[PDB]
Amino acid sequence: SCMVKFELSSSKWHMTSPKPHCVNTTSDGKLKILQSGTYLIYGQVIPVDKKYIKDNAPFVVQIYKKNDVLQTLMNDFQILPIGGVYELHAGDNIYLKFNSKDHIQKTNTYWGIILMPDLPFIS
Amino acid sequence: SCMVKFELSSSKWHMTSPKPHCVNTTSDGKLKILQSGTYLIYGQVIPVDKKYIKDNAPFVVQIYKKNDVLQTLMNDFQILPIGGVYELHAGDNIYLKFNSKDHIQKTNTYWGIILMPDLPFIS
């Protein structure tokens, strides 16, 4: 059972155990994957209200795995759920990149991962 | 330990156990919470290429809890991760409504839930 949750407001991780077996975390909100497996990356990025962003810079969020883009997301400054099921390997780094971090409202913005268990049953 | 994933191409649920204690799933892709707790609702909704769009409806995806919309998402027909962390109660029906079923590439489109453990360990 391995899961972590980073709240950007406080810059703290919350975790299943004191020293999780599956991941290491950093206080800038990056993770390193210690256990290869199927992971669910999740989170919600809250944009600053668009009336307050006075140029034409798009609201963009990317999740990286090492130096590869796992996904690129953009909407018109509306709340953005992120992530999905990804196959990760020991040693992989996961981190988010923002078009501009001034777009991001720290309060209630969060992200993390959960090591998924196998799902061998089907109906 | 309780997780389910619905694959829209096959209309099958993939599950941690033969009869998950935490949730009831049905073959229309809906589900019902059996165990009160913190849940991570997740998924990715993949739109077809814009050149196949027949109708004039915008790309909108909603998650309902019982009869009220819980989450409303929309973009310019791009990949759409859904969900986030929500407190749900025994009895809550969770399901998805799309603006137009034709908008969806069933192949890589999935959603489901995981009952979340507590994350008591901080920093």
Experimental approach taken: X-ray
End-to-end CA distance of chain A: 24
Chain B neighbors of A78, CB-CB under 8 A: 74
Give the separation between CA B109 and CA A92, rounded to whole angstroms: 25
Q: How many CB atoms lie within 10 A of CB A62?
A: 16
> In this structure, what DSSP letter does residue B60 have?
E
Is the CB of residue A25 less than 8 Å from the CB of residue A4?
Answer: yes
Whether the CB of A58 is below 8 Å from some CB of chain B: the reply is: no
Pairing of strands B31-33, B12-15: unpaired
Structure tokens, B21: 């204690």
Which residue of A lies nearest to B109 if distances are taken between CA atoms?
Answer: A84
Tokens 């829209």 correspond to B8
Residue-range definition of the domain harbouring residue A108: 1-123
Q: Do A40 and B1 touch (CB under 8 A)?
A: no
Closest CA to B110 of B68, B72, B79: B79
Q: Does B71 touch chain A (CB under 8 A)?
A: yes
Written as one string, the DSSP assignment of chain A is: --EEEEETTTTEEEESSSS-SSEEE-TTS-EEE-S-EEEEEEEEE-BPPGGG--S----EEEEEETTEEEEEEE-SS--EE--EEEEE-TT-EEEEEES-TTSB--TT-EEEEEEPPP--EE-
CA distance B72 to chain A (A): 10
The H or E element spanning position B114 is strand B110-115
Total domain count, chain A: 1
**What resolution in angstroms, rounded to 1 decimal?**
2.5
Cβ atoms of A42 and A83 closer than 8 Å: yes
Report which DSSP code applies to B50.
Answer: G
Judge whether B122 is closer than 8 Å to chain A, CB to CB: yes
Q: Which residues of B touch A5 (CB under 8 A)?
A: 85, 119
Q: Please work out, in degrees rounded to the nearest 5, the angle formed at the alpha carbon of residue B11 by the alpha carbons of B114 and B64.
A: 55
How many Cβ atoms sit within 10 Å of the Cβ of residue B117? 16
Strand partners, A65: A68, A94
Closest alpha carbon to A63 in A22, A36, A30: A30
- Judge whether B3 is closer than 8 Å to chain A, CB to CB: yes
Angle made by CA atoms A86, B70, B31, in degrees to the nearest 5? 65
Bridge pairing between strands B60-65 and A110-115? unpaired
In angstroms, the CA A30 to CA B26 distance is 37
CATH number of the domain that residue B16 is part of = 2.60.120.40
